[PDB]
Please model this.
Amino acid sequence: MVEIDPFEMAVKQLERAAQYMDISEEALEWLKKPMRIVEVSVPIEMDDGSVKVFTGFRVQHNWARGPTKGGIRWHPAETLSTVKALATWMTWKVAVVDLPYGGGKGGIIVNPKELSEREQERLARAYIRAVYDVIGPWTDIPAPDVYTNPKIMGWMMDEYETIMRRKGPAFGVITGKPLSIGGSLGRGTATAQGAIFTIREAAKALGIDLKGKKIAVQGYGNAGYYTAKLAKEQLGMTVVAVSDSRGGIYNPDGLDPDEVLKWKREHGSVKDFPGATNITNEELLELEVDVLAPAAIEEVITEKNADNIKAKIVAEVANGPVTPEADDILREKGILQIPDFLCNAGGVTVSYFEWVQNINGYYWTEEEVREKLDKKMTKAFWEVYNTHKDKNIHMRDAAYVVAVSRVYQAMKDRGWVKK
Model:
């Protein structure tokens, strides 16, 4: 009697957002089933001259607003209920920042640490020849995800340029490519620049002077380093405590976010930094700082430490790092938490800015991409926050109101749902 299917969990979080908006009964049952599911058998030839058959998928949820966009997962524990759950989730993520996109996902049941470099070419090309009839530059756009990389996405583009016979924009069939084949700049600081702009406007919303505030960051990945690096130079906040999988440090007078990387590659972790205090992630979450931003695994700020939070703006940079029971405890104390698909939506805004470049054929520089991302994540926050001021719901539920209202209004104008 204990079964948690991922696709049923994505449906239950849609029926929650059906009550905060006036939506008909005929559009509620339209959004609960994806509109085209393809499951193919993908054969490769191995290294010893023998044949295997891996099982691939491709799920396209809802193309009402435009061409669908979604990553590619390579994982041995992939199921169709886990691909469809991220396929529904991709529709409310590309719509909340107002892109002309729909949701999608694709997966292959394989373990990529047991294939050679040549066999990863014969799999990445044979996946394209199986689902070429349901993708394209204006139909369905792949992207990189877990156990894929920019090295592989160049190969899927090459097999598309062989099948299409070069009669159309082939560089726009896939985003997240290398720079010298038709990629875009600003993809290394893509996700972390999204959280900087919304923090800059959330402190504007409270009326806070940001010149000298304090920030604690859980996790020190590529997102955790780039958030703390740009917090000193762009905004000006005093970096006081960063952490990783080992533990956390502490300095109430400032930190170098760049020389820490000089230590972390040299040593094993940021443990025993000179002029620091080795504390845990548990004390780091309940510190007294101005703004918290987790760049770590899910469910870090839970109901067992929700009352002890001393902060003002919470930026959920990860994919759902806050439990639903910790929402109502945080909401009454006077804290403002950013949704999971609103803070890190920069990885979809920058990946959309590549597809505009490849369709036109004119590549922008680092100044033009930073400027046009600055207007997108500013407007998408003041549609979400002002919706929270009108009906007085939590910021997690308030972003679900704006995300479905755009897709339902595009479904009603295309004539699909009359009422």
Q: What stands out?
A: The radius of gyration is 22 Å. The longest strand covers residues 36-45. The chain has two domains: 36-181, 182-418.
